[PDB]
Amino acid sequence: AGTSICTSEEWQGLMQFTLPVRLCKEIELFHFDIGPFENMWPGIFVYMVHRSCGTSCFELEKLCRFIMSVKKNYRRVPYHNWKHAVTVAHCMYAILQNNHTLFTDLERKGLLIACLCHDLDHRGFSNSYLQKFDHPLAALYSTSTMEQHHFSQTVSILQLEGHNIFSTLSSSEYEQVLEIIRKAIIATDLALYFGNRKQLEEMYQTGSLNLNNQSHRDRVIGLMMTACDLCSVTKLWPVTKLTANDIYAEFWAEGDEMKKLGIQPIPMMDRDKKDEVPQGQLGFYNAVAIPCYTTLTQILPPTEPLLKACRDNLSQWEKVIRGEETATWI
Ligand SMILES: Cc1ccnc(N)c1[N+](=O)[O-]
Numbered sequence: 001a002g003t004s005i006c007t008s009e010e011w012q013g014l015m016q017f018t019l020p021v022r023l024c025k026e027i028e029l030f031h032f033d034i035g036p037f038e039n040m041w042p043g044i045f046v047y048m049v050h051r052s053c054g055t056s057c058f059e060l061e062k063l064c065r066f067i068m069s070v071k072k073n074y075r076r077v078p079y080h081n082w083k084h085a086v087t088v089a090h091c092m093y094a095i096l097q098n099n100h101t102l103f104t105d106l107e108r109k110g111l112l113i114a115c116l117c118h119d120l121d122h123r124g125f126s127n128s129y130l131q132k133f134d135h136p137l138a139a140l141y142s143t144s145t146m147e148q149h150h151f152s153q154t155v156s157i158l159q160l161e162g163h164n165i166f167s168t169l170s171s172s173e174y175e176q177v178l179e180i181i182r183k184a185i186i187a188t189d190l191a192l193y194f195g196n197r198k199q200l201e202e203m204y205q206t207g208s209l210n211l212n213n214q215s216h217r218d219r220v221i222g223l224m225m226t227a228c229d230l231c232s233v234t235k236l237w238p239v240t241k242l243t244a245n246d247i248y249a250e251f252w253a254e255g256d257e258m259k260k261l262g263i264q265p266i267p268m269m270d271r272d273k274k275d276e277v278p279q280g281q282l283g284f285y286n287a288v289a290i291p292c293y294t295t296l297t298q299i300l301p302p303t304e305p306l307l308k309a310c311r312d313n314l315s316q317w318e319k320v321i322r323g324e325e326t327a328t329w330i
């Protein structure tokens with residue numbers, strides 16, 4: 001019920017936060033893992049907004065209120081949580097820093113915010129589940145069900161007193177940024193990714209791809225969102241493997257619910273089918289992750305380290321399948 005709002009203590013605390021100096025260098029890198037720095041996550045987001053967009057892009061009080069309320073509207077689910085949000089935002093920061101002048105000031109601020117917000121109020125259930133069991137959300141949002149909800153949650157947070165970080169934009173730019181954010185969040189529906197990547201691959205290979213063409217821009221931005229959403233697969237192996245544990249924890253909980261409603265879940269969501277996970281990851285990397293980072297690297301050459309890391313992780317899943325895995329901690 002309702003939108004959660006941070007405390008005075010929470011946002012005033014973030015305002016006074018200072019990022020440890022050693023992390024300034026690390027945060028610029030694609031492979032940076034926020035994992036070991038939980039207390040710093042909101043501060044890391046402020047830092048990234050300030051470096052990409054400028055210290056005066058948003059009023060500081062409103063930005064800190066906005067961030068801490070965003071955190072409060074992520075649920076305590078195993079994967080689609082606050083940590084995922086900040087991780088996705090950091091990948092976007094790294095893509096933007098490496099491609100800075102391709103994107104307008106409006107796009108950069110919109111996208112970093114879009115990434116922080118893109119899974120807002122996720123309940124640990126897939127679009128598949130919501131539509132199968134006719135959740136009210138599936139009635140309201142016929143396609144891209146959770147993503148339309150996440151966007152709606154974003155707008156609800158902006159509408160809280162003192163939270164509207166975009167108010168100082170012209171009426172035209174304000175409309176433009178909300179549209180950038182809407183399209184970006186909707187694009188995190190993996191259903192849409194397959195069509196988008198295919199089209200972009202075609203536009204690229206024929207050389208019709210043109211970033212001055214708004215519809216092309218929207219599609220490139222869409223693939224950036226996919227690349228950021230999936231970036232757990234671009235980290236160092238132990239990080240990728242630990243995150244995969246959280247992804248599956250969520251899946252198995254959904255699968256358990258389906259069994260109670262008389263439907264056998266897909267194997268991926270079946271906790272009694274963990275033997276199939278390594279092959280399932282192989283499938284996911286071959287079908288989704290590798291093609292994504294492949295096309296993204298063609299369009300944005302500086303993103304190549306995402307693709308190299310993804311390939312290294314595919315090799316690791318292959319090693320698992322062959323029985324070559326070494327000691328793992330969880
Ligand atoms: C969405 C998804 C599904 C299966 N395996 C994954 N690694 C994954 N992912 O990366 O988010």
Ligand code: NI
Pocket residue numbers: 118119146188189
């Ligand atoms: Ni999502």
Ligand code: NI
Pocket residue numbers: 080084088118119188229
């Ligand atoms: Ni996500």
